[PDB]
Assembly symmetry: D2
Homo-oligomer: 491 residues x 4
């Protein structure tokens, strides 16, 4: 056994006693020793005041989540595409942490609420930590970075009531066409995954990979579930929201405690700069996919999730990912949404966790060290602050090693831009309508789902939603209208 | 009509554009102007970095809640008991704010979860802000202050899984007998109110009120709903949690907008020092009630809630109550739980909100000013910091006016105490069993509710639970074991 | 009379009393009522716990400073150069706040320390707050943004000792040539001004100003003290440093309380894009000035400082400036140092003061309001959070106005390039000229030598040697004169 | 790997410490054409290093902001187990690792080491029974004996709320209105207010504490640490010149002495006093303005300590170290000294703000020699210690056996508000102090010289009050200060 102590190592005799000077007991039928509590009762203050400070801000988005440790293995040679050390040589293994999450829901909300799902993985490489911060859909609601807070605002609560507002929700989406593609995924049954074990991961954005000769290619990354894609119907997700809000969390934890380790197979699509020039859409458009016919998937690795964390708060809660955490061989593209993400994530980490959040164990570059003599001091500096090491570069008395050193071309002035709609923007949602209804029940599900949601909205706004979905296939607005009034008929 | 600006007031022409230098477009079939985002895009960084910082910590407890403004009225003369200015003269109106809450649930959790409910009221008087930080039960789970974090921890999530753990839950309560009284409430249908409009508020603790002669008396405050006490059945509460996790929030906001303003009538129980000496229990025991036959309720006022906040975060989320915020005429008793609360609430405020949280509007002493020249500086000092006023008392150049009988008596040494069980502790739980089953279904409900929750616990711990309830009435344990078996049979 | 209360408005009878239960007095020749302090003593805990939290971090740089309110007046029509609202019409007056500062010293350090001086002024205009964050020199130590923390670190304290380290100090400067120009200023007597009233302000950087047709010109801004430029000698500065560390602060506060209000006349230098293409140096180089011969100053305004703050902490300490706080008519240039500043200052403010620091009175846009429905919540939200105004643009139930929206601008060609400014022979030319400019005044040149010599005599020999080489890059005699005087200083031990 | 590789905070290798990414302006037409353009959001190296620079600073301590530290060894040299059961005092020859911080009081971070102030003398002992802080001053007494006066006192010692200048009016207005300061002020104005170095001053517990022997018999104590380097002071003039020449003089003195191996050391003594002996005294053991006379209570030698090791990083160790008088071990308790009593609360409270909620996880602050085990205290910001993984967060958890280490004054009356009231004896000891100086030539004139220079900047009316005040100790003093006040006014 060990000895129960205060935060400073002073042993404690009883966990439950507090100091008091008792009232005089003369006259009392019942006289337990009661009196005012004392400032000197250190055990009391020291435990209370720590209790008082247990909480940190939840993430602005993706607040609700579960995570696990595991292993990534390189299974094919792709060194002709990508020079990254963790991909160096076949059969090489890298430790990973993956956090799954919903989007809008706050910390106590339901695992089975309707949302995209977050799929973020930290790779502890010899070249630093690489964060693959992916969603469970290959596309997204926006392609203008600054629209994010607007969008996310209308996904959450009314500033006054603190209730979800169907009016906001649809006012935003219908006013911004480009959201159509992702909204259709959201209201399809894909919006309601059974478990994290049964969903895919997609980079969404295009990134840029470099081989060791300095030749680069556009890439899109797919992680595909060896457990297969299974989804829930609205009724079922709804019931589970009430019976078990932590369903997915529980699912993933138990799977792992049993030995039923879920795993994913990892592919990429690649494309050259010349190839990109001939497309009807931009590689920088987060609302688009690369058709599988024209750009096939190339296998490169897999990963398996096999180890639960030891304490949830310390690891799952405090872990911090950013797309700007990358390694040599992988750069980000000019996808403007991704570009802004490069700044946000570290910025928000500094607020949610604190200036030195990389010093928290899960966030440490465990496989490679770090040596950054220029970043010093700041709150809660626990890593030794490099002792006496000089804090500027080329110090006479500290020799440091630096690593060995066509691309895209730019023309024009500095220009303000908001992505402008063209005809092709409706084409990909059109095809997705066709992709559903290659399965019985899928099209009818979308309609029934969009309809239950939209029926609480005011009429003038329901109308705009019909118009909106009809931009994909005219039948959809009609079918949704037809279902909305069936629901109103009942009561 | 307003003009859309930066945080610094500079006007903005388009809310959606961001600055880039575009890629050369020779050869592209589709050529939108895309390029890397720039540091100089102030509108971009300004709105993102703020977005990155929207969240503050949720309250360690009572995180999930709803609030409203109202009016309190003095309806009878109680100046013989209490000298407080806001009870001065009959007919006197005081503006209030009330926040209702559940206890253990985090911010996205369900309104209709089984819990006590918080009932906290801020009174803006001529003598300062008075916080009556009440529960919807006249008792509580604990009477030793330092047990609170232990208790609350077992009420929440497992350190490793982040799941609720029925093992913890019952392992704590059964190990700590004194919880039995409150747990019987919690598992009665009273653990599940229909709305906040249909519940009572109770001071729980005993306070001390003083009249203008300096004569004091122990008090217990009752707030009784003019809307009557209505509860939900477990089946319903579980459904509501799934269909509408914001049921109680919506209920309150809608009532008020409709003009169905809820109200409560206010009563006190009073008791002299002499009287207290003759009781089989302590006035300082939070697990005890004052029987109504022995100490009758005296009406003194009513309050009505009639005004929704304008911004939920700014008012309802940022408001800070503390039992140590009192006025002349009301002091705290030696109730050691209450004692410890006097420290915690301001302590936690300084962490949740910030050192100067009393400068946030809802938290201001609106009716009376403040003038506290010793309290200066600190982060986010927004109230002017008293300009040039000297910052010590009896400064030569700053003249200040200050405000213009037998009390309790103490003897002995400083003594460490943990409240020790006596036979009477089980007596009041016994009576509550008799109080239930004066209504058909109440008793069977308690058993049903305790059995459903406990069936997921391991056998050895189910066993302790039976023991535990039987300490109130022997049939109860046996009835729970009966239903536990029945439920296990089906599965 | 006002009534002494707690933070919560409860009246307090005695400022000095604390609650206790007394020890039994029996047997005591002296028995004052003493006992353990109580948790329920709210007056105690409330005032102590606030006292516990009085401090916030100091600025990473320019920590030590003094501020005042004033008035800016447009005195000439420059609407042909700049469309900014506060420069609209002749005679227009704008409320300002200026904060003067030293660079490297911490909060307790001396006002008469050798350092550049900061000169930051916040203008409350009808189109938002404009910060003109200037120094007292038209140039600076660096022209590569990311070098700043390196440079600053070496100006400050050794990671182990917490002492200044003359080895670091010179190690950095000497390894980075471009600092020579500004280092010469620093060690001439201009690194030691007499007061803040007797120094000039310069934009340092090149900015871009736009008239209402959309025609833009590169600018450099000059604030010239009507009280003239007066400097101290080393020995005087050092003595004052021991006698009155707050010399400059006192001086400014007293001048204004007398009515001896200090003032500055404002000029600009302008230059067209076409003119810039012909120069031997870059408009984007913070280590260069624009010769007065070729680009003459144009007078446009004046400001006077005439009002002390009411509470120093609340106003001088908490005020936050940022070069990215600008108004229509004025944009930053591609000066990479300036560029990085655009990000830094608001970033640091969020740390030093907090997420919602603009809500602090001095930092508010007082003359124009603000309406930014996208920015909500965050810690210490005190401005009402816009009540129930929808928090997204083009909300169906919230009608909004935007400001009314061209000519040839700068043009860009190439790939994304990593660049660290590379030395050319012209970099030494302007330091060479500054040696000639000193020595048109007796004693100026010999001062720089003495000042560099006394500082560098605590450095190890091997590093002293690099310093002579360094100054000798401007004019050879300077190393030799410094080596000579360092050796004659060593002579005594 | 040696030489170390230069990386970002996340471990990614960097090629050049000084480069930043841009897209260059077109160079056609330029006589000089370096590649200049707008900086980019994607430049991680830039944002990463700037944003951390932006956050280097934390609040300085409210008082004692200017300091220097070193590590050393304390040795038990005598048997005092009849007085104190403290483990680190257990057996003769036992060595304990300590860290000591020396500081001035009111000065801020950039201020002079040789300013006139008391000097702090704080030492952390890492014992097997937890961390012990002996938070001492270089004088055996202090300015106040009423706790809540501290902020008033400290405010007037510092800067004017409007000017930010020191205000001699304030300074003395406070001191003269509060008589009990006279004793300490004499110390302060004697040459002892200006030590030559930290090596050449003593440390004194100031307060009375209570030590327990293993039988549980206690005794009041006072601790003295006496410099083996002797007590050497400076003259005001010297103190003022050094202030300009070398504001870091004491820091440099300490560092250099240690680096040379001229380790400074202190011998440790205690005075003891029984409860009964305390009853017969003309003053209280609880009065910090009082010393125990050496004739009646002789010093008993018990140990020594030596400071032999400079810190590796100043910020990480010296700056972030946190001491509190409430950090104690078994065998040592605090007394009822009300100033000490309030200090028990203050120091932890301030720590949580200066450093943060989990400051005890910072290395220098860890109980290094004893572990800790406090399963109740979890989560909270920058939680870096592993948060005890899966260990239950409540006591007497069915699934986690814990061990609890196994183990006077009397009180009578009501709760009473007290401000200590002046009696005739208060002036007596300052009177003795005047006699103690002037046993050495130049000491009495000095005090006079020093008080005069400081006071000659105050307004006349307040100078008068200062004369009266010193005269309360000995009438000549007032008149001698008035005398040298003019000798100065006439030079
Ligand atoms: C009511 C009276 C006092 C109060 C409320 C008080 C409070 C404080 C506070 C808030 C700090 C800053 C600590 C930190 O920021 O980590 C501090 C530091 C300090 N105090 Fe006091 N103090 C009082 C009197 C005293 C006395 C009587 C002594 C001498 C016995 C003393 C010695 C020190 C020392 C040496 C430090 C700095 C320790 C370090 O370097 O961390 N103080 N005190």
């Amino acid at each position: 056994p060990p000895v129960f102590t205060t935060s400073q190592g002073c042993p404690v005799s009883d966990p439950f006693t507090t100091q008091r000077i008792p009232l005089d007991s003369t006259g009392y039928k019942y006289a337990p020793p009661i009196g005012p509590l004392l400032l000197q009762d250190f055990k009391l203050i020291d435990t209370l005041s720590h209790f008082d400070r247990e909480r940190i801000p939840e993430r602005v988005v993706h607040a609700k989540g579960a995570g696990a440790y595991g292993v990534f293995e390189v299974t094919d040679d792709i060194t002709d595409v990508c020079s990254a050390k963790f991909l160096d040589t076949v059969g090489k293994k890298t430790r990973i942490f993956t956090r799954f999450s919903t989007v809008g829901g706050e910390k106590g909300s339901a695992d089975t609420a309707r949302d995209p799902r977050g799929f973020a993985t930290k790779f502890y490489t010899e070249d630093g930590n690489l964060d693959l911060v992916y969603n469970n859909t290959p596309i997204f609601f926006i392609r203008d970075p600054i629209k994010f807070p607007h969008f996310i605002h209308t996904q959450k609560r009314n500033p006054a009531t603190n209730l979800k507002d169907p009016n906001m929700f649809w006012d935003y989406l219908t006013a911004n066409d480009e959201s159509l593609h992702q909204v259709m995924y959201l209201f399809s049954n894909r919006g309601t995954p059974a478990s994290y074990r049964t969903m895919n991961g997609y980079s969404g954005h295009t990134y840029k990979w470099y081989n060791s000769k300095g030749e680069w290619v556009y890439v899109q990354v797919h992680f595909i579930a060896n457990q297969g894609v299974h989804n829930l119907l609205d009724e079922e997700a709804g019931r589970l929201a009430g019976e078990d809000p932590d369903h997915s969390t529980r699912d993933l934890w138990e799977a792992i405690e049993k030995g039923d380790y879920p795993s994913w197979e990892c592919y990429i699509q690649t494309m050259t700069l010349e190839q990109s020039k001939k497309l009807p859409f931009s590689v920088f458009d987060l609302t688009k996919v690369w058709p599988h016919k024209d750009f096939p998937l190339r296998h490169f690795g897999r990963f398996t999730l096999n180890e639960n964390p030891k304490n949830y708060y310390a690891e799952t809660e405090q872990i911090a990912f950013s797309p700007s955490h990358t390694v040599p061989g992988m750069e980000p593209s000019n996808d403007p949404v991704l570009q802004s993400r490069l700044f946000s994530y570290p910025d928000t980490h500094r607020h949610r966790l604190g200036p030195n959040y990389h010093q928290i164990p899960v966030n440490c570059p465990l496989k490679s060290g770090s040596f950054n003599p220029i970043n010093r001091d700041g709150p809660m500096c626990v890593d030794g602050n490099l002792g006496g090491t000089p804090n500027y570069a080329n110090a006479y008395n500290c020799p440091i090693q630096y690593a060995v050193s066509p691309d895209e071309k730019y023309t024009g002035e500095v220009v303000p831009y908001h992505w402008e709609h063209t005809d092709y923007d409706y084409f990909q949602p059109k095809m997705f309508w066709k992709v559903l209804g290659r399965t019985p029940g899928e099209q009818e599900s979308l309609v029934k789902n969009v309809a239950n949601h939209v029926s609480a909205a005011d009429e003038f706004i329901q109308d705009r939603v019909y118009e909106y979905f009809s931009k994909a296939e005219p039948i959809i607005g009609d079918l949704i209208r037809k279902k909305v009034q069936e629901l109103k008929r009942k009561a």
